[PDB]
Write a protein that binds this ligand. Structure first.
Ligand SMILES: *[C@@H]1O[C@H](CO)[C@@H](O[C@@H]2O[C@H](CO)[C@@H](O)[C@H](O)[C@H]2NC(C)=O)[C@H](O)[C@H]1NC(C)=O
Ligand SMILES: *[C@@H]1O[C@H](CO)[C@@H](O[C@@H]2O[C@H](CO)[C@@H](O)[C@H](O)[C@H]2NC(C)=O)[C@H](O)[C@H]1NC(C)=O
Ligand SMILES: [Cu+2]
Ligand SMILES: [Cu+2]
Ligand SMILES: [Cu+2]
Ligand SMILES: [Cu+2]
Ligand SMILES: [F-]
Length: 497
């Protein structure tokens, strides 16, 4: 049931009841999560998105981001509304036509207009590698080995009251789970394995907000990929996964034939597993069809710690081995007050003219780009360092950069940087008060790339900036199709702008 690399994707409204409570949703492919889009490394994806939305309570416009894909030469296809495009209006379609050179791993797609992905438009995106260096570590890698973790809300995203705390109502594992309050015995997801086989489980957080503590009773997990980056094998018994992150792990079906709880404990919302909340079932072939009776430990023996991850390939770290040892070293001031986030004293409010369009129209420095103060120029062919010191309320904040992955030179909860062999990824927790999480990358992809907290509620409240990488080369590097050029006039007409 995987679709792609060339496919239609219809976006519609429908009622769904993934925890036994019915509500309307915004869906790709008629389901929550959406269908898996898949192809092989280097493929041309042609995803024609049909906007068939009619319920204004969840917005009738849309735009879809392909999270983690670099979009080199195709910045217009990246998806963030008002950064790279105007939204697609209802009754229209748009062909996201791009290539995935040099990438293979586990990705996802989601609406990138307002908080609309929280209403349901989220799904997995897998780029297989026919020559995968990790192939011999497992026997099975297919749609049945994808595990999605999602938060689900009973209140519609646009209808979350101003100044009330937002928490989810259920954790969904592969689209099913039980509500934290008024819990009913709605069906749980089942992941089926065969005794003796080894599985590449692809763990995808499609969360709008919480991080999860993910574990499988009786089993351990050997991490082999992080946000699209192959890793050295790291065996763990629990993974803390933040919004938008992905891990692949090998699961060895080496326990007695039976039923085992799969656990995903969010950092907010319901605590524990009473009534089967926060749970799914790992069932071996031949086991009785019944709920697991297993328990978690009190304390996990080998939780994932991010500094223990290292790339499988010799990726190194660009620049020099000390703070500020980059061509463009930046330190962002990340703050929250009075309901709004800010970066360097500016709260992000999406502009009327998308940033890419402003560049292609001739705005050639970042001081000329709107929103004022929210667009930072980066020079071409340069090592960039970005320090993201934590402290702003609502953390721990998972920061994400479009167009790039990056070396995580300093991670949460550990003051020691690693300039030798840190993992590279695309979404990183910036940790807690006093931390100084820091990332490095090189600028070889001209275009405006969003940088933001991936808790969608924080993005909406302004926790974002745009890196306008290599403004002078953006137009030549990113030729745009006529259909893209048509988006802004159509949106502005339909909205009387
Ligand atoms: C996080 O690391 C950055 C450097 O990557 C630190 O930035 C320095 O900050 C001081 C003032 O605090 C300046 O005098 C320096 O110019 C900055 N750059 C350097 C030394 O390279 C920042 O202070 C650190 N923040 C925390 C909270 O530890
Ligand atoms: C804190 O982070 C540092 C840097 O990533 C970790 O230090 C590395 O530890 C490994 C494993 O012992 C050594 O091979 C490396 O040489 C260390 N690198 C440096 C620069 O010190 C450290 O292990 C982390 N702390 C904890 C408690 O995990
Ligand atoms: Cu994303
Ligand atoms: Cu992204
Ligand atoms: Cu945040
Ligand atoms: Cu984004
Ligand atoms: F991305």
């Amino acid at each position: 049931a995987q679709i792609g690399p060339v496919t239609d994707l219809h976006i519609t409204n429908a009622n769904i009841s993934p925890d036994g409570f019915s509500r309307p949703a915004v869906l790709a492919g008629g389901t929550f999560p959406g269908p898996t889009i898949a192809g092989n490394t280097g493929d041309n994806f042609q995803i024609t998105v049909f906007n068939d939305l009619t319920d204004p309570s969840m917005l009738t416009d849309t735009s879809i981001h392909w999270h983690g894909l670099f979009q080199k030469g195709t910045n217009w296809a990246d998806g963030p509304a008002f950064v790279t495009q105007c939204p697609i209006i209802t009754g229209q379609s748009f062909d996201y036509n791009f290539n995935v050179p040099g990438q293979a791993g586990t990705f996802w797609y989601h609406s990138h207009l307002s908080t609309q992905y929280c209403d349901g438009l989220r799904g997995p995106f897998v780029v297989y590698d026919p020559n995968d260096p990790n192939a011999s570590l497992y026997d099975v890698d297919d749609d049945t080995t994808i595990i999605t973790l999602a938060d689900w809300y009973h209140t519609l995203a646009q209808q979350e009251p101003i100044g009330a705390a937002i928490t989810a109502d259920a954790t969904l594992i592969n689209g099913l789970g039980r509500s934290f309050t008024n819990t009913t015995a709605s069906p749980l997801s089942v992941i089926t394995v065969q005794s003796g086989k080894r599985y590449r489980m692809r763990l995808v957080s499609i969360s709008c907000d919480p991080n999860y503590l993910f574990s499988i009773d009786g089993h351990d997990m050997t991490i082999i990929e992080v946000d699209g980056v192959n890793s050295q094998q790291l065996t763990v018994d629990q993974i803390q996964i933040f919004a938008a992150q992905r891990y692949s792990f090998v699961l060895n079906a080496n326990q007695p034939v039976g039923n085992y709880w799969i656990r995903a404990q969010p950092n907010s919302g319901g605590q524990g597993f009473d009534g089967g909340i926060n749970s799914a079932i790992l069932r071996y072939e031949g086991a009785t069809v019944e709920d697991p009776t297993t328990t978690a430990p009190t304390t996990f023996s080998n939780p994932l710690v991010e500094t223990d991850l290292h790339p499988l390939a010799d990726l190194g770290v660009p620049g020099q081995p000390f703070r500020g040892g980059a061509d463009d070293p930046l330190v962002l001031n990340l703050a929250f007050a009075n309901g709004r986030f800010s970066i360097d004293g500016v709260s992000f409010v999406p502009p009327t003219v998308p940033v890419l369009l402003q560049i292609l129209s001739g705005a050639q420095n970042a001081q000329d780009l709107l929103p004022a103060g929210s667009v930072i120029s980066l020079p071409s062919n340069s090592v960039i360092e970005v320090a993201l010191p934590a402290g702003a309320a609502g953390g721990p904040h998972p920061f994400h950069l479009h167009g790039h992955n990056f070396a995580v030179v300093q991670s949460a909860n550990n003051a020691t940087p690693n300039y030798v062999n840190p993992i590279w990824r695309d979404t990183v927790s910036i940790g807690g008060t006093g931390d100084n999480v820091t990332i490095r990358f090189t600028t070889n992809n001209p275009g405006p790339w969003f940088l933001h907290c991936h808790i969608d509620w924080h993005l909406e409240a302004g926790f974002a900036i745009v890196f306008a990488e290599d403004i002078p080369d953006t137009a030549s590097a990113n030729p745009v199709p006529q259909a893209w050029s048509d988006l802004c006039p159509a949106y502005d007409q339909a909205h009387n702008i």
